[PDB]
């Protein structure tokens, strides 16, 4: 317990409290820096106040400010709320507001992060498709599986090297039909994940083998349209890629659609013939 008292204030890193060139010459810095300056100025003015000679009232006066300041960087608002000069009566985000905040650190450490090998487009019923697979736009697959393709280009005559294989695809008109054959070869037995708007349960994400197809839409199987509460009035589904041989192993072993047939809620099937199939089978 002697540590609760502060005499050495850790300063947050620099790149984490940037100073950046914006537009026209506008700059942009993390609010933390106005607060840091606060403390440093006060701390300095204090020293020089002690040294110059010290009239009591003034030294406390400062020590007060100083204190307040030391609060500011740590947590703003617990005691009064500091403001950047007339423009925004806004609480300069305190280190606290950083960690907790309306949208803070552990907070958005759970709202979400953006995946690097992702995609998203409109969905469309894929009647002939088997539960096993899913229709994925080659155009999308290209970008998605770019690196997997690049290398595969080099293993074949289509390109000398990576950087080459890259510029070979930087423009749309430049793709030899040999590339599609390469990607279609790269995707052989790999599978991807498809997500739906609200991911309410684990079946909210399922794995399928991509069967590359033309156009913009994503071909989805009718049977799993029940697991994802996804109808076709424009509902769009995202798509992710398992990069490790491990992630791929799990993905297609324990996450593949055609494997998870019965619900975790009830021992009742979720691969039930939805609307059109019954109607048929009934009549």
């Amino acid at each position: 317990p002697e540590w609760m008292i502060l005499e050495a204030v850790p300063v947050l890193p620099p790149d984490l409290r940037p100073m950046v060139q914006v537009d026209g010459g506008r700059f942009a810095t993390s609010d933390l820096n106005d607060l840091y300056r606060r403390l440093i100025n006060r701390n300095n003015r204090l020293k020089k106040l002690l040294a110059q000679g010290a009239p009591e009232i003034i030294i406390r006066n400062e020590k007060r400010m100083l204190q307040e300041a030391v609060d500011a960087l740590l947590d703003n608002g617990r005691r009064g709320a500091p403001v950047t000069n007339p423009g925004s009566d806004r609480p300069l985000r305190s280190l606290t507001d950083i960690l907790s905040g309306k949208q803070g650190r552990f907070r958005q450490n759970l709202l979400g992060k953006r995946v690097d090998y992702s995609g998203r487009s409109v969905i469309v019923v894929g009647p002939q498709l088997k539960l096993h697979q899913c229709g994925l736009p080659k155009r999308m697959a290209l970008e998605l599986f770019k690196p997997f393709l690049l290398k595969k280009m080099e293993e074949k005559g289509i390109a000398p090297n990576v950087k080459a294989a890259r510029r070979m695809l930087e423009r749309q008109r430049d793709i030899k039909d040999e590339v599609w054959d390469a990607l279609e070869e790269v995707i052989h037995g790999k599978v991807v994940l498809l997500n739906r708007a609200p991911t309410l349960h684990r079946l909210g994400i399922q794995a399928f083998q991509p069967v590359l197809v033309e156009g913009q839409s994503i071909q989805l199987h009718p049977l799993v349209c029940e697991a994802f509460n996804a109808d076709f009035d424009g509902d769009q589904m995202a798509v992710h890629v398992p990069l490790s041989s491990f992630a791929q192993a799990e993905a297609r072993i324990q996450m593949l659609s055609a494997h998870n047939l019965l619900s975790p809620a009830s021992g009742e099937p979720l691969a039930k013939p939805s609307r059109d199939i019954i109607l048929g089978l009934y009549y």
């Binding site: 009232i57 406390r60 006066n61 007060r64 400010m65 307040e68 009064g80």
Partner: peptide, 12 residues
């Protein structure tokens, strides 16, 4: 409480 008043009073 609020910092201006207290010093004002303090030296005044």
């Amino acid at each position: 409480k609020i910092s201006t008043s207290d010093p004002v009073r303090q030296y005044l």
